[PDB]
């Protein structure tokens, strides 16, 4: 995930009748009053990557007076320049996806199909990794045990080995039919060459088992835990919290060590939960500091944190060099003073207006 956004344009999308917003590399801070169009900008980006669902109603995203919606999105990933365009005129919708000038997909489903393979992330797992909504900062922590390690695989980069393991089943099976061409006929010296291909297909399965879940994925994930646990403590201690050290199990369940006992995230306060969820998400980023240079989007993370913890969190974000571009929404001033680019958003007549500052 060498993910980075460039710019977005949006017409009649919720409160934004028309707005073009430029993104920059670094700590981009979007500030405004409540209901001023802050969260509405990221609902538009999510709309560009993944079309409207039943959960993403058009009547919900159309400007209540208007009857159409248009949005185009520029971004880079692994070096290529992409351009997604989505519209809904008067009942019909269309979508275009350009790759370095020339188009790549021309239908809505074709764009959705193209997005999920370029990102390697689907609609649902995109909300647990890149786009973290309000209060759902700890949602990644409390996920189901299967879902927790499922979204961890994408967060650590291991999920690309599962793409080989499934493409190996295509490879193993096809070399098996070249063996069926001898096996399906050897019934009803150079016999040694018959055994040369049989021992060769058997080799592929044990190679498929290497890329498998229990093979190298678990092995690499097991070797990743102490590193994340080290970075988790480095960032969590910045909150000057009174706890010995934060233990991270291999199942990515978090345990906090108190002096006279051991506590879990259930017992931790609303703010202490956020203190762990952020520092863990940064520990994952700091773990693969150069392997997976992913961008991060946050919607009001300093909520539930007191005056001091909001301040300390800013100094944490400033020393973070592992994430190239992290866009943060806040109604708090503790993050204006640490950002490089501050995007101010106000509202006039139910219509939002964007003012970019360099």
């Amino acid at each position: 995930m060498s993910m980075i956004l460039k710019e977005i344009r949006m017409n009649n999308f919720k409160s934004h009748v028309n707005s073009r917003i430029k993104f920059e590399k670094g700590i981009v801070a979007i500030i405004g009053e409540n209901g001023s169009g802050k969260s509405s900008i990221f609902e538009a980006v999510f709309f560009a990557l993944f079309g409207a669902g039943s959960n993403f109603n058009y009547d919900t995203i159309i400007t209540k007076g208007k009857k159409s919606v248009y949005v185009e999105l520029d971004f880079e990933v692994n070096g290529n320049n992409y351009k997604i365009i989505r519209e809904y005129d008067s009942g019909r919708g269309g979508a275009k996806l350009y790759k370095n000038g020339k188009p790549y997909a021309t239908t809505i489903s074709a764009v959705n199909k193209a997005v999920n393979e370029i990102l390697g992330v689907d609609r649902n797992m995109f909300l647990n990794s890149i786009y973290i909504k309000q209060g759902e900062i700890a949602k990644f922590l409390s996920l189901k045990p299967s879902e927790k390690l499922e979204t961890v695989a994408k967060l650590l980069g291991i999920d690309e080995f599962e793409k080989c393991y499934q493409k190996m089943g295509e490879i193993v099976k096809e070399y098996e039919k070249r063996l069926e061409r001898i096996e399906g006929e050897l019934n009803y010296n150079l016999e040694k060459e018959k055994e040369k291909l049989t021992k060769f297909v058997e080799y592929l399965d044990k190679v498929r088992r290497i890329f498998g879940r229990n093979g190298f994925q678990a092995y690499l994930r097991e070797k990743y835990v102490p590193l994340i646990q080290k970075y988790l403590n480095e960032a969590f201690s910045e909150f000057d919290l009174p706890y010995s050290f934060v233990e991270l199990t291999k199942d990515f369940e978090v345990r906090v060590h108190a002096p006279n006992g051991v506590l879990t995230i259930d017992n931790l306060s609303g703010g202490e939960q956020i203190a762990v969820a952020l520092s863990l998400r940064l520990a994952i980023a700091n773990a693969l500091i150069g392997n997976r240079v992913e961008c991060i989007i946050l919607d009001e993370p300093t909520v539930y944190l007191d005056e001091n913890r909001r301040a300390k969190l800013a100094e944490i974000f400033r020393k973070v060099k592992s994430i190239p571009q992290m866009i943060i929404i806040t109604h708090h001033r503790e993050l204006e003073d640490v950002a490089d680019v501050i995007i101010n958003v106000k509202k006039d007549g139910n219509v939002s207006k964007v003012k970019i500052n360099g």
């Binding site: 793409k163 080989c164 070399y175 190679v207 290497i210 070797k223 403590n233 204006e336 360099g358």
Partner: protein, 351 residues
């Protein structure tokens, strides 16, 4: 004809969410003012980061105000440049330094001073972020044109220069025009060396702000500079460093039974009651509680008791050719012809 270069006081910084660490910043700042008043220097050059925030507490504003009022009442002209923590971020709000407008000259341009019959050129500007460097270079080139007439000239900047802070530098070294002295800030490492037939100097912080700076305080005391610009030129000889008294820190990495002996003799052989940090083995903590009164606080941990290379290492441990696993790992992920690559392996290098 002497002046003081001081910077990075960070008034209002409440380290560890602790009241004592907030006051420790005020005292050292008050003590810096006290020593400055005891010296009675002709000019005071504050080169940024006086406050820690843009909306500091009422106490920190009173402490700073009544401090710079004393300096102005003793006919000491104080020049300041706005720091990165002092540049207003929003529209209508003001910098905290605006309360000091009638006792301190906030530098965003040029100014000349008469000191016992000699013109000395002072110039400076606020903190320019790395984005607006091109505007900064035009401000520095203007300060160069207005300076060629004066043999004595000083430059006040609150930036980071490339060969000194590589992480967050906003200016390179060759963009700095010739000046006799460079009164800089924004890095808390106390730095003093020659640069372009002059002296480039970072006065450094006044109190230990970020934890990487007690290693300095034991080596390089924290405080301000006292520069003697009486002669026509400037050297390292005529610059005296003034050290202030800070909060002591005691670093311990107790994983052995010999690492408990290092504590008491160090905790007492320091000026004030220190702050302990690091790691302490769990078996040592209850017998360590006896001196928690001769310490301030203990932010110490209780301790109990490259994939491409690792993939091949794993395959060979299972008994499989790792170079094959890796080259295949690239063939399908890059969507190359695994057909053309697999057919070769079975023929030549198989058993």
């Amino acid at each position: 004809m002497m002046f003081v270069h001081i910077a990075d006081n960070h008034l209002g910084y409440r380290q560890y969410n602790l009241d004592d660490r907030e006051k420790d910043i005020y005292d050292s700042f008050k003590l810096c003012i006290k020593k400055i008043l005891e010296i009675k220097p002709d000019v005071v050059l504050h080169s940024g980061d006086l406050f820690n925030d843009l909306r500091p507490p009422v106490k920190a504003l009173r402490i700073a105000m009544q401090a710079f009022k004393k300096l102005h009442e003793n006919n000491i002209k104080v020049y300041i440049v706005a720091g990165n923590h002092e540049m207003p971020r929003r529209l209508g709000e003001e910098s905290p330094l605006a309360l000091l407008k009638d006792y301190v000259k906030i530098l965003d341009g040029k100014d000349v001073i008469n000191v016992n019959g000699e013109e000395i050129f002072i110039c400076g500007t606020y903190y320019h972020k790395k984005s607006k460097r091109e505007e900064m270079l035009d401000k520095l080139k203007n300060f160069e044109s207005e300076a060629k007439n004066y043999k004595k000239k000083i430059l006040m900047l609150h930036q980071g220069i490339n060969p000194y802070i590589p992480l967050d530098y906003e200016l390179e070294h060759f963009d700095l025009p010739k000046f006799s002295y460079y009164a800089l800030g924004h890095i808390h490492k106390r730095i003093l060396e020659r640069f372009n037939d002059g002296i480039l100097a970072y006065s450094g912080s006044t109190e230990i702000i970020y934890r990487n700076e007690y290693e300095d305080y034991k080596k390089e005391g924290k405080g301000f500079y006292l520069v003697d610009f009486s002669g026509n030129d400037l050297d390292i000889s005529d610059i005296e460093k003034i050290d202030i008294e800070c909060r002591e820190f005691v670093e311990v990495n107790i994983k052995d039974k010999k690492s408990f002996n290092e504590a008491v003799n160090k905790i007492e052989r320091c000026k004030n009651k220190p702050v302990v940090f690091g790691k302490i083995k769990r078996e040592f903590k209850p017998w360590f509680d006896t001196l928690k009164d001769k310490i301030l606080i203990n932010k110490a941990i209780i301790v109990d008791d490259n994939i491409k290379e690792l993939l091949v290492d794993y395959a060979n441990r299972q008994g499989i050719d790792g170079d094959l696993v890796l080259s295949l790992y690239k063939a399908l992920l890059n969507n190359e012809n695994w057909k053309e690559l697999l057919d070769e392996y079975y023929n030549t290098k198989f058993r």
